[PDB]
C-alpha cells in the first residue's frame, strides 16, 4: 500500500516533463517563444495531457 | 486579423485575438493618391508599448 502510494505521486510529477507533442514541457518556453495566439495552441496541448 | 502584429498591429489599430467580424478592403489610388504624394494621411511609428 505504501509502495502504491508513492508509485502513483511519482509517476503524477514525472507526467508534468512529458510534452504530449507541444513544443516544451515548461509553460515558460513556450509563452516566452511563441506570440499570444500560437502560445495557446501549445498551452492547449499541455492542460490536455 | 486577429492575432498580427507590425507596425499598425502593435501601435495604429489592434484587433482582439478573438475577433467576431469582418475586414473588408479595397484600392482607393485614385481617390487617395496625390500626384506629390498624399500627406492627410499618416501612422504612429513609435509608442510606448
Known amino acids: 500500500v505504501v509502495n502504491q502510494n508513492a508509485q502513483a505521486l511519482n509517476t503524477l510529477v514525472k507526467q508534468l516533463s512529458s510534452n504530449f507533442g507541444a513544443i516544451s514541457s515548461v509553460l515558460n518556453d ?3 517563444r511563441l506570440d499570444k495566439v500560437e502560445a495557446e495552441v ?8 | 486579423a486577429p492575432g498580427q502584429t507590425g507596425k499598425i498591429a502593435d501601435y495604429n489599430y489592434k484587433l482582439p485575438d478573438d475577433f467576431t467580424g469582418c475586414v473588408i478592403a479595397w484600392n482607393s ?3 487617395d493618391s496625390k500626384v506629390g504624394g498624399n500627406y492627410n494621411y499618416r501612422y504612429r511609428l513609435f509608442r510606448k508599448s
Open chain 2, 29 to 31: 489610388n485614385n481617390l
Open chain 1, 30 to 32: 513556450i509563452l516566452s
Open chain 1, 42 to 49: 501549445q498551452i492547449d496541448r499541455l492542460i490536455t495531457g
